[PDB]
């Protein structure tokens, strides 16, 4: 089988920069008779299936911007993005089709660097229907921020910081390159009902005050 290798495994670049990524095959992908390299490049944006970008090593598929250029021959290929855009955020895969079985490289994950952005924070008390099952999940959403490492702090009854929390980050956004993240504090209903104030705070190494959102059980 032909082994395909790609490099680097991931790259992080800001909009407008040039990116170069390579793909090597264990034997030539050329057909000497027709002088074509039987190599394709696919782009897979977050949450989507792969899409054909380039085939025959340097022919672009319809719709693909000419910022993408495939080049190289034989065993060494290159995909260049002349000026990277936020929407190019994706994993890029090469694939040989010189011989069966058709095989793929492991991918180059392209990440986008951008300006810091503060989250939009929203806090939600446990669903009353969830309380009927005996569980209480307090949820906090921290949407459209950057960089990725943000600190979420839960406080129960005003500044008693708490920790049985589960956090989950989205992929980077294809349009604005931000991240979003859910922070969920799950307690029993009885523990939830022993306290009044529930607060979710977002910080990221700053002199800048946290974004704080709260609710009080005594609003009922």
């Amino acid at each position: 089988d032909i082994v395909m290798s790609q490099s680097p495994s991931s790259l992080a670049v800001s909009v407008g920069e040039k990116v170069t990524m390579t793909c090597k095959s264990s034997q030539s992908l050329l057909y000497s008779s027709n002088q074509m390299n039987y190599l394709a490049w696919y782009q897979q944006k977050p949450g989507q299936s792969p899409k054909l970008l380039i085939y025959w090593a340097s022919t672009r598929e319809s719709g693909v911007p000419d910022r993408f250029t495939g080049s190289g021959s034989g065993t060494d290929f290159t995909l260049t993005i002349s000026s990277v855009e936020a929407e190019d955020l994706a994993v890029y895969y090469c694939q040989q089709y010189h011989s069966y079985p058709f095989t793929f490289g492991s991918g180059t994950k392209l990440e986008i660097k951008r300006a810091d952005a503060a989250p939009t924070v929203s806090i939600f008390p446990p669903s009353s229907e969830q309380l009927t099952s005996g569980g209480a999940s307090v949820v906090c959403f921290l949407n459209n921020f950057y960089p990725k490492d943000i600190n979420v702090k839960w406080k129960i009854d005003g500044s008693e910081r708490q920790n049985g929390v589960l956090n989950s980050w989205t992929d980077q956004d294809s349009k604005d390159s931000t991240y979003s993240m859910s922070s969920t504090l799950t307690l029993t209903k009885d523990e939830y009902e022993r306290h009044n104030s529930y607060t979710c705070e977002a910080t990221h190494k700053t002199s800048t005050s946290p974004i704080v959102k709260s609710f009080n059980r005594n609003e009922c």
Binding site: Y38, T103, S137, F141, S182
Partner: protein, 222 residues
Amino acid sequence: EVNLEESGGGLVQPGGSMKLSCVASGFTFSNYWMNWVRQSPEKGLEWVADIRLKSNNYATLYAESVKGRFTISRDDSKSSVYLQMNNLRAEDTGIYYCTRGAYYRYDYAMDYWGQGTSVTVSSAKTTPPSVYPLAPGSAAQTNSMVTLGCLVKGYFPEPVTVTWNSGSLSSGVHTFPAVLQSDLYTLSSSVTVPSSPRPSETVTCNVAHPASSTKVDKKIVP
């Protein structure tokens, strides 16, 4: 517009059987070779099988790892390609894509891919989700935008599909990756709408869990 739509994934025990379907539209299905490609975190993208045209007696070729266990077949009258899998193993877990092979006879590149269908080979049991609406603490105390949420708890396996207003509400949505704990997944989805849409209009969270053949619709009420 060319479209490929996969269906049929779910959870199967090791040794089990499962058949995937892929319906094509927007092109003369009969004139094109078709493939099945799969993707997993551990193996990346893998070509699984291909199938040619009626004049080639629908000739098929397979990856070695599935040969003798999987069958790719097509029905040109239904514009569909299928993948019948037997004797399934844990390493057959992944997202399966049907793909169209490029028209030119020697161009084997795969120019259109479906959205994929998920296959889980596991001995664990299927567990449908509980779905809870997440409204803000106050519907009368707002800002110019309001964010609503939906908590999809205690299911197995992945995935679940969350939509808002049956997919009509698509902008301002964030559906977070599920978190696995005590063998069950939990995920949340948020949607941010102008203050003028809620609570003045109905907003509904729609959850599908294909493996348990379950659909739950929950209105987000004040």
